[PDB]
Motif scaffolding. Structure first.
Motif, mmCIF file in Angstrom:
data_model
loop_
_atom_site.group_PDB
_atom_site.id
_atom_site.type_symbol
_atom_site.label_atom_id
_atom_site.label_comp_id
_atom_site.label_asym_id
_atom_site.label_seq_id
_atom_site.Cartn_x
_atom_site.Cartn_y
_atom_site.Cartn_z
ATOM 1 N N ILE A 185 0.828 -1.206 0.000
ATOM 2 C CA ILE A 185 0.000 0.000 0.000
ATOM 3 C C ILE A 185 0.867 1.263 0.000
ATOM 4 N N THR A 186 1.701 1.418 1.030
ATOM 5 C CA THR A 186 2.403 2.681 1.288
ATOM 6 C C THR A 186 3.480 2.982 0.256
ATOM 7 N N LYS A 187 4.006 1.943 -0.375
ATOM 8 C CA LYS A 187 5.056 2.116 -1.364
ATOM 9 C C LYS A 187 4.613 1.614 -2.723
ATOM 10 N N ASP A 188 3.316 1.331 -2.861
ATOM 11 C CA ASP A 188 2.768 0.680 -4.059
ATOM 12 C C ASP A 188 3.619 -0.531 -4.459
ATOM 13 N N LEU A 189 4.181 -1.206 -3.461
ATOM 14 C CA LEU A 189 5.166 -2.248 -3.703
ATOM 15 C C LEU A 189 4.562 -3.458 -4.409
ATOM 16 N N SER A 190 5.311 -3.945 -5.392
ATOM 17 C CA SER A 190 4.944 -5.089 -6.205
ATOM 18 C C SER A 190 6.142 -6.044 -6.175
ATOM 19 N N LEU A 191 5.895 -7.352 -6.189
ATOM 20 C CA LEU A 191 6.981 -8.339 -6.086
ATOM 21 C C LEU A 191 6.860 -9.504 -7.064
ATOM 22 N N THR A 192 8.015 -10.003 -7.508
ATOM 23 C CA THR A 192 8.097 -11.210 -8.339
ATOM 24 C C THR A 192 7.909 -12.444 -7.444
ATOM 25 N N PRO A 193 7.704 -13.631 -8.047
ATOM 26 C CA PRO A 193 7.529 -14.834 -7.229
ATOM 27 C C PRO A 193 8.650 -15.051 -6.211
ATOM 28 N N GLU A 194 9.901 -15.034 -6.680
ATOM 29 C CA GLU A 194 11.081 -15.323 -5.846
ATOM 30 C C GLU A 194 11.244 -14.328 -4.699
ATOM 31 N N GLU A 195 10.902 -13.074 -4.960
ATOM 32 C CA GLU A 195 10.946 -12.046 -3.934
ATOM 33 C C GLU A 195 9.881 -12.309 -2.880
ATOM 34 N N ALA A 196 8.646 -12.524 -3.339
ATOM 35 C CA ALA A 196 7.514 -12.830 -2.476
ATOM 36 C C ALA A 196 7.805 -14.022 -1.568
ATOM 37 N N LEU A 197 8.487 -15.030 -2.108
ATOM 38 C CA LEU A 197 8.889 -16.184 -1.317
ATOM 39 C C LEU A 197 9.919 -15.781 -0.262
ATOM 40 N N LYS A 198 11.006 -15.145 -0.704
ATOM 41 C CA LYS A 198 12.099 -14.749 0.192
ATOM 42 C C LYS A 198 11.592 -13.855 1.329
ATOM 43 N N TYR A 199 10.657 -12.961 1.024
ATOM 44 C CA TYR A 199 10.110 -12.046 2.027
ATOM 45 C C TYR A 199 9.012 -12.655 2.912
ATOM 46 N N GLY A 200 8.709 -13.939 2.713
ATOM 47 C CA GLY A 200 7.698 -14.650 3.506
ATOM 48 C C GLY A 200 6.286 -14.092 3.348
ATOM 49 N N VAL A 201 5.884 -13.905 2.091
ATOM 50 C CA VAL A 201 4.547 -13.450 1.729
ATOM 51 C C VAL A 201 3.769 -14.606 1.086
ATOM 52 N N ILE A 202 4.476 -15.472 0.353
ATOM 53 C CA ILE A 202 3.847 -16.643 -0.275
ATOM 54 C C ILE A 202 4.533 -17.942 0.165
ATOM 55 N N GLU A 203 3.942 -19.090 -0.163
ATOM 56 C CA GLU A 203 4.507 -20.365 0.279
ATOM 57 C C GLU A 203 5.110 -21.220 -0.837
ATOM 58 N N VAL A 204 4.717 -20.964 -2.085
ATOM 59 C CA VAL A 204 5.108 -21.823 -3.201
ATOM 60 C C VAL A 204 5.357 -21.025 -4.488
ATOM 61 N N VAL A 205 6.420 -21.390 -5.205
ATOM 62 C CA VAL A 205 6.628 -20.965 -6.589
ATOM 63 C C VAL A 205 6.520 -22.232 -7.445
ATOM 64 N N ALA A 206 5.601 -22.231 -8.413
ATOM 65 C CA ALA A 206 5.351 -23.425 -9.235
ATOM 66 C C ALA A 206 4.932 -23.085 -10.661
ATOM 67 N N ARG A 207 5.437 -23.851 -11.629
ATOM 68 C CA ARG A 207 5.184 -23.576 -13.051
ATOM 69 C C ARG A 207 3.801 -24.054 -13.494
ATOM 70 N N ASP A 208 3.309 -25.124 -12.872
ATOM 71 C CA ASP A 208 1.984 -25.664 -13.190
ATOM 72 C C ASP A 208 1.346 -26.394 -11.992
ATOM 73 N N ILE A 209 0.111 -26.863 -12.182
ATOM 74 C CA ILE A 209 -0.694 -27.505 -11.134
ATOM 75 C C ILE A 209 0.008 -28.695 -10.500
ATOM 76 N N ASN A 210 0.608 -29.534 -11.341
ATOM 77 C CA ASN A 210 1.322 -30.719 -10.874
ATOM 78 C C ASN A 210 2.534 -30.389 -10.006
ATOM 79 N N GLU A 211 3.304 -29.373 -10.399
ATOM 80 C CA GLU A 211 4.397 -28.897 -9.554
ATOM 81 C C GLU A 211 3.841 -28.263 -8.268
ATOM 82 N N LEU A 212 2.743 -27.515 -8.382
ATOM 83 C CA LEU A 212 2.101 -26.941 -7.196
ATOM 84 C C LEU A 212 1.759 -28.027 -6.188
ATOM 85 N N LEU A 213 1.124 -29.097 -6.661
ATOM 86 C CA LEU A 213 0.742 -30.208 -5.797
ATOM 87 C C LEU A 213 1.964 -30.852 -5.147
#
Ligand SMILES: [Cl-]
Lengths: 219, 8, 219
Positions: free
Chosen positions: A147-175
């Motif tokens: 919000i405050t910085k209009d901050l946007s992140l790539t998958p790898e960044e979001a992972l490193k910063y502890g915002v998301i849990e998984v980076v996956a190319r497709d459903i099978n990799e997600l699973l």
């Protein structure tokens, strides 16, 4: 009756009242089928606060885990989609996707100019986004910066910063990657360990009405 | 850019 | 002596971007034909703030008077529709219509529940609605109560309290009673006196796009 089932649905475009209906329809199907989880392939550039909040609520009350998957490559869970993500059991991102940029606005002028919100309503959405993040054990500092910085992140960044849990190319990799993970929020009062071994994957087709209404809001 | 408001 | 052209359009349903588009389309047509006025038969339960503000703004820039006519009986100009009325050159209401009820909310929830608006939003709309009432010489005290008390008014009440200018059963009576009335806001800097002696009424049909969006809505 002795099957392990994962539903996959697709949600694309502006988050509106009708997007709520979609989430509710897809999640309801998965609940009534006793699905292990539902994966929602999400691509949204923006949307409305009220529908967003209703979706988060519906996810909070879901009787099965809801996995928000920013997919396909080039998708974003920007604006309202970020809250939806932060409000869910697990977040995955496909390579080349985006998360963030959640500044609340009053909307758009005749120009297309941005109509900003009063400073205090920015503080309201800051509180709300911080709440979602801390309730799901995710980085509320970074979430605030969406919000405050209009901050946007790539998958790898979001992972490193502890915002998301998984980076996956497709459903099978997600699973494969999310298998054995605990949900970040409870399902019916209990944190749940995802069991995706020996799983049947069922795709829920968007309906004619979904595609049409999406296409119309597009223009 | 979440759009905030409606009214009853 | 001269032949005065009055346009009449219908605008119905929730106030959105498509509604702005209708207001812009119908007003542009009346402007290019050098109309004396455009009357808008308005029936709306509410809608989005940004579109509402864009509509008020489009009405301010209008090179001809815009008359908001709450029509037909049973119609209302509630919530967002009240601001459009108050932002226009003249307001008329048919017997059995409603105006007011403008207390802002973030939106409605799953189970009839209502998501509260933070005080800032509330105060912001109080100042806005008071302003529109002040600029048009309409009762700002009562306009505030449209928000603070969710006050709704009958046509007879609305006239008595100085929120509107005309109570009329149809286009005929409206022109007759409003003939000789000064507009409540300027048209291009001056307050126009309405000439409805020798009038040609022209009805504008909604476009294909208008009809499609609303038929989808009716489901
Ligand atoms: Cl478990």
């Amino acid at each position: 009756l002795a099957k392990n089932i994962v539903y996959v649905a697709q949600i694309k475009g502006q988050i509106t009242s009708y997007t709520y209906d979609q989430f509710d329809r897809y999640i309801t199907i998965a609940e009534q089928d006793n699905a292990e989880a539902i994966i929602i392939e999400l691509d949204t550039p923006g949307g409305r606060a009220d529908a967003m909040m209703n979706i988060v609520q519906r996810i909070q009350q879901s009787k099965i885990p809801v996995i928000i998957y920013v997919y396909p490559p080039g998708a974003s869970a920007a604006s309202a989609g970020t809250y939806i993500a932060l409000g869910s059991h697990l977040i995955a991102m496909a390579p080349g996707t985006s998360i963030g940029a959640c500044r609340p606005i009053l909307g758009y002028s005749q120009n297309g100019s941005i109509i900003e919100a009063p400073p205090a309503i920015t503080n309201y959405f800051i509180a709300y986004i911080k709440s979602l993040a801390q309730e799901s054990g995710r980085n509320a500092t970074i979430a605030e910066e969406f919000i405050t910085k209009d901050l946007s992140l790539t998958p790898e960044e979001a992972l490193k910063y502890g915002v998301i849990e998984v980076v996956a190319r497709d459903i099978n990799e997600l699973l494969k990657k999310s298998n054995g993970m605990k949900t970040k929020i409870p399902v019916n009062g209990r944190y749940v360990t995802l069991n995706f071994t020996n799983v049947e994957v069922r795709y829920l087709a968007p309906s004619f009405k979904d595609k049409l209404i999406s296409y119309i809001t597009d223009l | 850019n979440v759009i905030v408001l409606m009214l009853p």
